[PDB]
A and B are shown apart, each in its own frame.
Chain A
């Protein structure tokens, strides 16, 4: 009888706030450049696609 765990009883809530903002938001994390050489933060997004476009 050394280490007694505890618990807390509380409702676990998957509520539903305003969704159509939250859906659009991980689009603006990815930009798209109209340039030949890019700016070393799109350039590791652009490489990550050219891997898994070569497996599907």
Chain B
């Protein structure tokens, strides 16, 4: 029952992730930082191409 114990919170955290994923897309012309959660940014000299 450890799968029924541990992955139950992993189900609801994935279920809550589907709630915030609806929030981010918003308007077409929405934001330059709210779109900076899914698509990534990094430190200096990461993107080679």
Do most interface residues of chain A lie in helix, strand or loop, or is the interface mixed?
Answer: loop
A19: B residues at CB distance < 8 A = none
Interface residues on B, range: under 10
Give the A-B contact count at a CB cut-off of 8 A: 11
Tell me the count of chain A residues lying within 8 A, CB to CB, of chain B: 4
Q: Which of A27-43 contact B (CB under 8 A)?
A: 34-37
What distance in Å separates the Cβ of A11 from its nearest Cβ neighbour in chain B? 53
B29: A residues at CB distance < 8 A = 35-37
8 extra A-B contacts, CB within 8 A, seeds A35-B29, A36-B30, A37-B28: A34-B32, A35-B31, A35-B32, A36-B29, A36-B31, A36-B32, A36-B35, A37-B29
